[PDB]
Amino acid sequence: YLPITVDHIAGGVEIVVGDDGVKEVKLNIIEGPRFFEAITLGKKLDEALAIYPRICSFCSAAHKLTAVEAAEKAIGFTPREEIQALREVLYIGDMIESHALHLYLLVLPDYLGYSGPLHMIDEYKKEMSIALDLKNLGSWMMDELGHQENAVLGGFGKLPDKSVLENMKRRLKEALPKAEYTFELFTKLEQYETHIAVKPRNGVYGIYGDYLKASDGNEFPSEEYREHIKEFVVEHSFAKHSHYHGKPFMVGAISRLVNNADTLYGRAKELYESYKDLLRSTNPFANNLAQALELVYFTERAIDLIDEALAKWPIRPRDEVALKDGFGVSTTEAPRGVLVYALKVENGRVSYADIITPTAFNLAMMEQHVRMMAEKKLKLLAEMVVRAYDPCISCSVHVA
């Protein structure tokens, strides 16, 4: 061929400002999992199941936990209630870790104006103690139940001892008041700083909890529905936004609270009934607080699941038989928001794969959440608006 030379000069948001006010706000913070969706096909179901947790591995364990569900949902075979509850337990641990980390390491420096080394002795001592306790607890749950390659289709690879489970329950019992304190601390801090306007909330609906569910949650709910995804930013496009019912919508703890309010019970139900006004369906920041509330709820529910798991002392991972031409669409509820896994299997191999992340759902409204009117400083406010949605990683860039 013909050889030439063209030197190519080579994640955050960009807001272009002006003297007459702000004109254009744009973001390219995430990529598409499309690549995986094209390389996981043609491989074994287990192989693809091993490739899947590579996407947003910052919250890895959740993916492989809904993927398998889709697989089961494809083969028609249903897992037992015990192993389902166990999946829900691992899910809970992951939830706890992620939300503790996010809330304390991201939201607390936002409001308290902290930077650099987060560890301080004048303040954030008890808060770092709590945060570390929750992080360690969740990560230990994930290390025990799940390093990796533990969760297999139909039944798990290895199960921990019952004593470890009882001790885990005790640990939760010791961890609850720290989550209550966390909820208090996040009940004290500021909302909308103001960015407060109608945002559709969207979260799954379960019989007892918003952990796992088969029906999408909206003022007009749906069991299996595909919403209009719009390719945007085409000039400087890195991702494609999503429009539910033809409008930018939001997912996250707020959505789960709005949709599954009545399904809630325990201390979390009381705290909700108390702070019912503090978390509005039109404010992005309350989500943080909501997560703290979810740090309480999922702490208690877990125990019940354990008491649901001890219903049968002898436990053995079941096995499933694969089914050809099987469509399975698992819609789980990751900490980031509702996570979507669509898997159609043919000849025991991957035929169709469509995975959608909560971040993509929140992207549209987050772009719409920008009514920020300030004169810089505003980069921090925008960063707080962004961290109110709990992104994997983010940064603010303002062109002047």
Partner: protein
């Protein structure tokens, strides 16, 4: 990042094709520095995706990886990365602080080759 880099490549190639008045692109050869932690398959794929809907659709992407060359000025000494490769987790890192000039004892070595990425070959059909 793979997708951003591939997007830069796509936009650049389409722009150049818009400069030379190309009707279609048949093949593209890109030289990449090994300092880049991007995965070749992901970048190739992303290029293949963003080329769709354009005149560069269906082109054959060929990646050529170039080596990294370091040069310390404290003793005017030049060395490579493969030599320091064999001496496991988090093996790749920013060479600015990770490693020194293996001879003198001062880490201020200038990067000459393998840091940048550039398109080498383009098959223009007009």
């Amino acid at each position: 990042h793979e997708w951003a880099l591939a997007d830069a490549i796509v936009r650049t190639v389409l722009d150049y094709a818009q400069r030379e008045g190309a009707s279609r692109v048949k093949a593209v050869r890109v030289v990449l520095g090994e300092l880049q932690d991007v995965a070749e398959d992901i970048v190739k794929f992303a290029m293949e995706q963003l080329f769709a809907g354009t005149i560069a659709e269906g082109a054959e992407i060929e990646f050529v990886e170039e080596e990294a060359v370091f040069k310390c000025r404290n003793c005017n000494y030049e060395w490579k990365l493969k030599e320091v490769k064999d001496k496991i987790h988090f093996i790749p890192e920013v060479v600015h602080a990770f490693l020194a000039c293996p001879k003198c004892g001062s880490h201020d070595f200038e990067v000459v080759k393998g840091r940048g990425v550039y398109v080498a070959g383009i098959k223009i059909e007009k």
